[PDB]
Design a protein around this ligand. Structure first.
Ligand code: ZN
Lengths: 107, 97, 186
């Protein structure tokens, strides 16, 4: 979302100089007084949160149900899933398994 | 496909052949009609045809921020000369196209 | 800055989030309708896209020429202004204008009836102009002001302006080259 001034067609800015915040121009005295709330952002940007809690972190997130492997079915890999990019795109699932001398991690 | 309905006629009027102009404002929506606000002054030239228009603007209504208007006036027109000031008052009385 | 943090993942309550947001942002103060804070609803700032200039409320659709004219006849029957653009040159010859093979133009014709507009089944349209038919279609849609006006030069020093109205639609008229070839083989 963006706004342009009806009087002059340039972009508005947001400022406060009195009891109430205002949408104003920088070339002409046109202004609108914001009394209400608007609900759409520019979707800000901060990078990949990978090792927020890397390694064998806290045990509060334990859960009961889990899947199983098709080949061997040994007793150690409980579930986990993750996300792609931003607020409006899907989230992904990976099944990674790891004892030794192999390379498995199923999507 | 035969002609079905509304087989209407067309006619030519020469009454305004040299008197007709079409004026369009790219920067303003069609719903935002200009008719309400009182027009004040305009200028024209016949050859290399061009026009200028002078448009009243309200200063008392809240959406006119008076202080910035006064600053613009002081910045654009003389402090007390006012012999050929773009505005009669010390604020924006009008705007031009 | 804190380091000892025990996170939680147990299921939470949606209405609790709604209540928290309500308390955070729904404590309205719009009752502060003081003079210098009043807003004229017909003076708002505007959305970029002209069709959707409804960014804050008080709380184009497909078209075809046969549709446009028939609503302009049946649903409404008042006057309207249209802007249409014609082919470079019309079937007529310059009437006793003495001619370079100049193209005839509307500026060089007389008043009176000049032809008929024909609407055909399935909504096809043709402009019967003399011995030839010219196809007609609506032009590119518009969303901005187009005011029709008349320039009265009353005197060499000064004149008068009157607005006549605004234009809502455009029409494009074209020769039907296929028809001309079919009539006269080459
Ligand atoms: Zn401005």
């Amino acid at each position: 979302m963006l706004l342009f001034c009806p009087g002059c067609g340039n972009g508005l800015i947001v400022e406060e100089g009195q009891r109430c915040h205002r949408f104003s121009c920088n070339t002409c005295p046109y202004v609108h007084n914001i009394t209400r709330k608007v609900t759409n952002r520019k979707y800000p940007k901060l990078k990949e949160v990978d090792d927020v809690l890397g390694g064998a972190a806290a045990w509060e997130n334990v859960d009961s149900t889990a899947e199983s492997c098709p080949k061997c079915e040994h007793p150690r890999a409980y579930f986990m899933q993750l996300q792609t990019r931003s607020a409006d795109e899907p989230m992904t699932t990976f099944y990674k398994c790891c004892n030794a001398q192999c390379g498995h991690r199923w999507r | 496909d035969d002609p079905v309905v509304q087989e209407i006629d067309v006619y030519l009027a020469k009454s305004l052949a040299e008197k007709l102009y079409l004026f369009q404002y790219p920067v303003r929506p069609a719903s935002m009609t200009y008719d309400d606000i009182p027009h004040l002054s305009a200028k024209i030239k016949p050859k290399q045809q061009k026009v200028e228009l002078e448009m009243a603007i309200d200063t008392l209504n809240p959406n006119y921020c008076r202080s910035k208007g006064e600053q613009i006036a002081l910045n654009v027109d003389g402090a007390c000369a006012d012999e050929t000031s773009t505005y009669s008052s010390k604020l924006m009385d009008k705007q031009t196209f | 800055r804190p380091e000892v943090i025990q996170s939680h993942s147990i299921f939470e309550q949606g209405p609790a989030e709604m209540m928290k947001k309500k308390g955070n942002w729904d404590k309205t103060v719009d009752v502060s309708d003081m003079g210098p804070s009043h807003i004229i609803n017909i003076k708002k700032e505007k959305r970029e896209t002209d069709e959707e200039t409804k960014q804050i409320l008080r709380m184009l659709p497909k078209d075809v020429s046969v549709a446009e004219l028939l609503r302009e006849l049946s649903l409404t029957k008042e006057e309207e202004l249209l802007f249409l653009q014609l082919p470079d040159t019309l079937p007529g010859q310059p009437p006793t204008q003495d001619i370079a093979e100049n193209a005839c133009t509307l500026a060089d014709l007389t008043e009176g009836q000049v032809g008929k507009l024909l609407i055909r089944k399935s909504g096809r349209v043709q402009l019967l102009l003399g011995k030839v038919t010219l196809d007609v279609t609506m032009g590119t849609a518009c969303s901005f002001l187009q005011e029709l006006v008349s320039v009265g030069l009353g005197d060499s020093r000064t004149g008068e302006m009157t607005v006549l109205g605004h234009v809502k639609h455009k029409l494009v008229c074209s020769p039907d080259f296929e028809s001309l070839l079919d009539h006269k083989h080459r």
